[PDB]
Amino acid sequence: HHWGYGKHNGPEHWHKDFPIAKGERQSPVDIDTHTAKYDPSLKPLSVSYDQATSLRILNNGHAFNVEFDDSQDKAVLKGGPLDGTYRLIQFHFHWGSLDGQGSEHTVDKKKYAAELHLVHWNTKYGDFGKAVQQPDGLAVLGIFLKVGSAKPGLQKVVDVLDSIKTKGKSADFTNFDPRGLLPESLDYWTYPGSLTTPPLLECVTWIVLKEPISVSSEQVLKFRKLNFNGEGEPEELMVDNWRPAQPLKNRQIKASF
C-alpha cells in the first residue's frame, strides 16, 4: 500500500509512514500576498540554464521527471535568498483533473491549473543524496501554469509523454532547454519549507515566481492522459497529483518585489 494521491493513500494518510508530514515547515502553503513582506536583504535571483543538459524523462507513478546531468557545474540557481550555488537535477509538474485546480502552492487561496517544480541541490553538499540531509540542502523554483495561450517551449515535453504513459517507463530526453518554461518576470515569494511528496523532507528553500506561464488546454490535457498505474494494470489517470496547502506555523513569506 504505497503512498499516492487517492482516497486511501493520499496526503491525509502520508503522516503515518512519514510523521514529518505534520512537521514545523511543511510545503506547500498558501501565499497570502498581503501578509508577505518585501525583503531588501534579498539579492537579485540568478537563473543560469544556458548549459543545462537533460538526459531523459520518466513516469515514476506520481508525476513525470525530466532529469538532468548534474555531474558538472551547469544549470545553476543562485542569488535571492540562496547562499551559494544550487544545481538543477530535475523538474516535474503537479496538475489537476480540471483547470480550476492542480497547483500545490496557492496565491490568496487561488489554485492554478498546474505547478512546475525545478529542483536544485546545494553544491556545498557534494550531491543530491547528502543535500537532503541538510536544512538548506535544496532549492525548488516553483512556477504556476494557467490555461490560455500555448507555451511553445513545453511542446517537446508534451509530445514525448505518449512514450511514458505508465509507471516505470522512461525515454531519452536530451537537449531540452528549461529556459523555455520561464515567465518574463523573476519576481518571487520565498520561504523555508519541504518536499511536497514523501519523504516530505524539510530541506527546501522555496522560490515561487509571481508570474505564471500560460499553457494551452491541449497541452495540459495531454498531461492528464498519463497513468498512475503500471503497464497492464487498470487505468487510473494521472491527475490531481498535488498536495494541498499546509499550516504556515512559525514562518514568514518574503517578497522579492
Binding residues for Zn(2+): 92, 94, 117
- Residue 34 to residue 245: CA distance in whole angstroms: 17
Element at 147 (helix H, strand E):
strand 138-147
Please identify, using beta-carbon distances, which residue of 154 and 207 lies nearer to ligand BOW. 207
Binding residues for substrate: 196-197
Cβ neighbors of 124 (< 8 A, separation 6 or more) are 84
d(CA 103, CA 94): 6
Q: How far apart are CA 39 and CA 24, in angstroms?
A: 22
CB 132 → ligand BOW: shortest distance, Å? 5
Does position 116 interact with ligand BOW (CB under 6 A)? The reply is no
Residues 3-32 vs Cl ion: string with x where CB under 5 A? ---x--------------------------
- The catalytic position among 1, 15, 34, 62 is 62
Nearer to ligand BOW, 42 or 132 (CB): 132
State the Cα–Cα distance between residues 249 and 252, nearest whole angstrom: 9
Is residue 181 near ligand BOW by the rule CB under 6 A? no
* 120 forms part of the interface with Zn ion (CB under 5 A): no
Contact indicator for 191, 28 with CB cutoff of 8 Å: no
Residue 62 a catalytic site member = yes
Rounded to a whole number of angstroms, the minimum distance from the CB of residue 170 to ligand BOW is 16
CB of 196 to ligand BOW, least distance (A): 4
For the CB of residue 60, give the shortest distance to ligand BOW in the complex, in Å. Answer: 9
- Using the rule CB under 5 A, which residue among 25, 105, 111, 117 binds Zn ion? 117
Nearest to 77 by CA among 243, 188, 201, 155: 188
From the list Cl ion, ligand BOW, Zn ion, none, partner contacted by residue 54 (C-beta under 5 to 8 A by kind): none
The piece of 40-48, 116-124, 226-234, 246-254 that touches Zn ion (CB under 5 A) is 116-124
Query: Measuring CA to CA, which residue among 213, 210, 206 is closest to residue 188?
Result: 210
Residues with Cβ within 8 Å of residue 12, at least 6 apart in sequence: none
Handedness of CA 34, 39, 40, 44 (dihedral sign): negative
- Residue 195 touches ligand BOW, criterion: CB under 6 A: yes
Q: Which of 11, 52, 31 is nearest to 191 (CA)?
A: 31
**How big is the site for Zn ion, counted in residues (CB under 5 A)?**
1
Query: Three-state DSSP class for 212?
Result: coil
Positions at the binding site: 92, 94, 117, 196-197
User: Cell numbers of 68, please?
Assistant: 538532468
Site string (117-156) toward ligand BOW, x via CB under 6 A: x-x------------x-------x----------------
Q: How far is the CB of 103 from Zn ion (least distance, A)?
A: 10
Spatial distance between the Cα atoms of 102 and 50, rounded to a whole number of angstroms: 29
Task: Write out the catalytic residue numbers.
Answer: 62
- Interacting residues toward ligand BOW by CB under 6 A: 117, 119, 132, 140, 195-197, 199
